[PDB]
Design a binder for this molecule. Structure first.
Ligand SMILES: Nc1ncnc2c1ncn2[C@@H]1O[C@H](COP(=O)(O)OP(=O)(O)OP(=O)(O)O)[C@@H](O)[C@H]1O
Ligand SMILES: [Mg+2]
Lengths: 378, 47, 48, 99, 97, 51, 209, 40
């Protein structure tokens, strides 16, 4: 069964990558692993793990129990076909092929799925099979195979409303858009937060709340924060259960810049330890800094640099080296003076900065059709 | 008939249907011409 | 290739047969559609 | 209270209109209000971007400037680029596979 | 109907179709509730008990109608009180003649 | 005139149509002004109540 | 050459000297049915994306009937007066032309005018003049009518929920009809006009007096 | 074809740009800010 199956992958992440933190994960992950017939996905996890020398009988009792479930499919397919129902063979392994998917690998779980895809004339089984292929397409991070059945998925919701098959689906596309650094799309798929349910994969709905606020606080601007996430009763009460995130969100909204970094180290470090955010938490807070710098710095023109330590965040030379790499990083549109100790702003009219991305994409497609025109016709 | 792929043919005894059965269809048995032409078929009737 | 119950293209001067006009309708698909039964499935069966 | 916010800002856009720069001490006098909450509130205008401009800390000169920038020309030519890139990606699927 | 039609060699099988019990009123609310834009938390069982077995068509008669409540109050998510507001109206038509 | 029928003979078909043409032509979508209708029968029993 | 569409029926209800100047207030005592038809006709015309967004399948066509003198023509005059979309108003006994084909072309071009023109509103009266029940392929005067009903039967099906072409049909006797016309996908909304007894009745006394 | 004379012998790229900029910089913030609390 694939409904608890993501926590398994997250605890594989919890096992391997925190290197010192490798004891309770190889306890509880084994505690889930040498039961519920799991055989295949942890041989190289045993390689990353310790020896665990006597696993032979442990594998034999479970390939034996697996052999029981396979041999009773072999007890099922022939009474299923003598008196045929709705192809009762594929009706048996249309449900036990997911047992072949958690327990077996993707091959017996894939074929039998594309096999049983042609059985049910209605999408009430088909699209949920597609949901299973999406979920294993996440487990093996099959980033191209998700592209297929996302479209093949979406091709079925137009007939019907199927908002349990679309609002559930948008959770998947939000998790992919936050898997990659596509955050304006990740919050956009995370826009509703109402028809989203107390899920299986974010079994805390409030974890989903934390994720949509963390992506939204970059993804949308104030005209959207000061109406959207500040006036949602559906969003206010669930983080009313949160002290930190409520403070962490409001420290930007209430201009509380000094306590903002305090919670930023904690939230950013939690994002460091979190699975699937671990690729991009650096990308997160490098935007959070320059966003908080730009937000205050587009209010004043003649603000000195020794203002921001005691009021914005302490360390004058820290502000110096942090701003110098952001103007020098080509963003944070201003100009800092040094030996009269004052920071000036400017304004770029949207004619140069807007031009920049245009010449970027033009050079990219120039590279593209350059490369193709070399490739084809020898 | 949808799942076993039988020709689901109900009858209503309407007269718009009648022109496809025949000019008059003095019987109902003229329907069997099309029925054995769609030979795995199911005829359906109302009250 | 000449099928019974099939349209044709026809020249008009000598009524020489010109070309096979594709196909028109089944006499069951036509009236059948005119009826428009609400097609169903197992997946919409409530407890039967 | 919330109507008083919109009335406060209705006056606040009203008196700020006819000029480019002023000191906060005159607009505090001309709305007949303080300078700290007016300074923070003007900062919230240029945080929420409902009004745009800049502020000063040395004496509080609000530099007001506006022009509508050219936007339609560049980005609408820019998304055609990422259409056509995908078109060339489809050209793999009839060109690279085929000949 | 006809007794010659009730000749025992004539008919091969007669199958009875009962009105739904409380469980079979629940699942037609389930299937029929699929295509609607819902709000989280409904307890369809209560609403299935609010109808004491009309048929499989009053299920669709209610649950189609409950969106007219949310639309007439300009919602985009169907809430549970539209359903009990709809059972009060459809079951009034059960109470009419 | 007629009352209506349950569609007996072929003749009444277009005659009922001819009647309903007249009925819609009486007070359907028109300011019927300056034109006065005077009718007569021996039996007012074979008549459409809608007439 | 390809042509812009054309139909020689009521052109398009010329909208200047065409309003039957009937207010909603002129109709007393139809609180349920006037609000209900407002839901059915012009509410999906304007507020289309609530029907789209929730997805509750707004109705294709609508039938209304009952005893005569129950405001059947009158409500069409009021909705026809206060509407905003283009309105098409036909006298439904006119399709029986002497020449053949003028009827079916006369069917299809009206619908093409609703297609070309606007998210528009069809109104048909005296549906019993077309939709009877029995038929006879021995006259031709019946066979033409048979081909009339086939055209409209197809062309109602030839929609895709995208056009807001709403068909309003008003009759007197529901009995003398084919329920194949009343198939869902074609007809889903049926409105009887019962006679008010006292309650809405005194409202008509208030309005008329 | 492909004789090729031998004189010698997403998942990656968004990770590669954040590898470019996010390269060699303190790696372990849980304590840097908590030690700037009292020093700064
Ligand atoms: N508020 C009202 N409710 C009902 N009837 C009214 C009202 N006000 C006036 N009437 C009268 O009822 C008649 C309804 O007009 P209309 O032509 O719509 O009748 P109908 O229902 O179309 O019946 P028919 O098809 O025979 O004309 C009008 O002629 C009018 O005199
Ligand atoms: Mg009338």
């Amino acid at each position: 069964p694939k409904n608890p199956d993501l926590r398994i992958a997250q605890l594989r992440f919890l096992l391997s990558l925190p290197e010192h933190r490798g004891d309770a994960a190889v306890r509880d992950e084994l505690m889930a692993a040498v039961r519920d017939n799991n055989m295949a996905p942890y041989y190289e996890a045993l390689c990353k793990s310790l020896d665990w020398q006597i696993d032979v009988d442990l594998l034999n009792k479970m390939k034996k129990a697996n052999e029981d479930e396979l041999k009773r499919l072999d007890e099922e397919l022939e009474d299923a076909e003598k008196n045929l129902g709705e192809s009762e063979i594929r009706d048996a392994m249309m449900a036990k092929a997911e047992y072949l998917c958690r327990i077996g690998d993707k091959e017996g779980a894939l074929t039998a799925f594309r096999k049983t895809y042609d059985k049910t004339v209605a999408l009430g089984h088909r699209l949920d099979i597609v949901f299973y292929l999406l979920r294993i397409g996440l487990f093996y991070m099959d980033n191209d195979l998700i592209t297929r059945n996302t479209e093949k998925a979406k091709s079925l919701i137009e007939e019907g409303g199927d908002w349990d098959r679309r609002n559930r689906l948008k959770v998947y596309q939000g998790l992919y858009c936050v898997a990659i650094r596509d955050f304006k799309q990740a919050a956009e798929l995370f826009l509703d937060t109402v028809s989203t349910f107390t899920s299986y994969e974010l079994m805390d709905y409030k974890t989903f709340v934390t994720y949509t606020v963390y992506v939204s606080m970059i993804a949308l601007e104030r005209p959207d924060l000061r109406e959207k996430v500040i006036k949602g009763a559906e969003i206010l009460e669930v983080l009313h259960s949160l002290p930190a995130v409520r403070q962490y969100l409001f420290s930007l909204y209430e201009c509380r810049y000094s306590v903002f970094f305090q919670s930023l180290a904690v939230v950013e470090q939690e994002m460091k330890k979190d699975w699937l955010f671990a690729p991009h938490y650096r990308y997160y807070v490098r935007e959070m800094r320059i966003h908080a710098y730009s937000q205050l710095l587009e209010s004043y023109r003649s603000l000195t640099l020794g203002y921001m330590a005691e009021a914005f965040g302490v360390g004058v030379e820290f502000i110096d080296q942090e701003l110098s790499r952001f103007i020098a990083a080509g963003r944070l549109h201003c100009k800092i003076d040094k030996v009269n100790e004052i920071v000036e702003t400017n304004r770029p009219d949207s004619k140069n900065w807007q031009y920049q991305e245009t010449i970027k994409k033009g050079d990219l497609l120039l590279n593209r059709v350059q490369k193709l025109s070399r490739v084809i016709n020898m | 008939a949808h799942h076993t792929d039988c020709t689901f043919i109900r009858v209503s005894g309407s007269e718009l249907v009648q022109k496809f059965i025949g000019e008059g269809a003095r019987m109902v048995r003229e329907l069997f011409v099309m029925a054995r032409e769609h030979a795995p078929s199911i005829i359906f009737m109302d009250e | 290739d000449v099928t019974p119950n099939c349209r044709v293209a026809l020249r008009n001067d000598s009524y020489t047969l010109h070309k096979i006009l594709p196909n028109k309708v089944d006499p069951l698909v036509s009236l059948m559609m005119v009826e428009k039964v609400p097609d169903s499935t197992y997946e919409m069966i409530g407890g039967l | 209270a919330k109507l008083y916010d919109n009335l406060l800002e209705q006056n606040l856009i009203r008196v700020i209109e006819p000029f480019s720069r002023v000191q906060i001490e005159h607009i505090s006098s001309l709305i007949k209000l303080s300078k700290a909450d007016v300074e923070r509130k003007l900062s919230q205008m240029i945080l929420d971007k409902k009004f745009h401009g800049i502020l000063d800390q040395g004496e509080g000169v609000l530099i007001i400037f506006d022009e509508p920038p050219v936007d339609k020309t560049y980005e609408a030519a820019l998304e055609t680029i990422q259409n056509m890139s995908k078109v060339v990606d489809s050209l793999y699927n009839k060109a690279k596979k085929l000949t | 109907l006809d007794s010659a039609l009730l000749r025992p060699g004539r008919i091969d099988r007669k199958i009875e179709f009962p009105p739904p019990n409380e469980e079979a009123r629940l699942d037609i609310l389930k299937i029929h509730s699929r295509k609607m834009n819902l709000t989280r938390g409904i307890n369809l069982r209560k609403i299935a008990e609010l109808m004491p077995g009309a048929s499989g068509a009053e299920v669709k008669g209610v649950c189609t109608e409950a969106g007219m409540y949310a639309l007439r109050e300009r919602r985009v998510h169907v809430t549970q009180e539209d359903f009990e507001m709809a059972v009060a109206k459809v079951m009034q038509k059960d109470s009419e003649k | 005139g007629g009352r209506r029928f349950s569609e007996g003979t072929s003749a009444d078909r277009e005659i009922q149509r001819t009647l309903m043409e007249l009925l819609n032509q009486m007070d359907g979508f028109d300011t019927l002004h300056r034109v006065k209708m005077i009718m007569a029968t021996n039996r007012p029993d074979t008549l459409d109540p809608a007439l | 050459d390809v042509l812009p569409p054309e139909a020689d029926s009521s052109i398009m209800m010329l909208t200047s000297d065409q309003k039957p100047d009937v207010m909603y207030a002129d109709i007393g005592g139809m609180d349920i049915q006037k609000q209900e038809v407002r839901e059915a006709v012009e509410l999906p015309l304007t507020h289309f994306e609530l029907y789209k967004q929730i997805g509750i399948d707004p109705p294709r066509g609508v039938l209304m009937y009952g005893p005569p003198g129950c405001g059947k023509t009158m409500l069409a005059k009021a909705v026809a007066h206060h509407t905003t979309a283009a309105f098409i108003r036909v006298v439904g006994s006119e399709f029986v032309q002497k020449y053949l084909g003028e009827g079916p072309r006369m069917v299809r071009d009206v619908f093409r005018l609703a297609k070309e023109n606007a998210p528009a509103i069809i109104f048909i009266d005296e549906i019993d003049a077309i939709a009877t029940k029995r038929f006879d392929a021995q006259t031709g005067a019946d066979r033409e009518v048979q081909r009339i009903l086939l055209e409209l039967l197809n062309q109602m099906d030839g929609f895709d929920q995208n056009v807001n072409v709403k068909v309003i049909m008003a009759t007197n006797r529901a009995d003398t009809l084919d329920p194949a016309l009343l198939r869902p996908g074609r007809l889903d909304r049926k409105i009887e006009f019962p006679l008010p007894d006292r309650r809405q009745k005194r409202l008509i006394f208030s309005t008329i007096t | 074809m492909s004789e090729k004379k031998q004189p010698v012998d997403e998942d990656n790229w968004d990770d590669d740009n954040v590898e470019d900029d996010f390269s060699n910089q303190l790696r372990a913030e849980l304590e840097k800010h908590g030690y700037k609390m009292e020093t700064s």
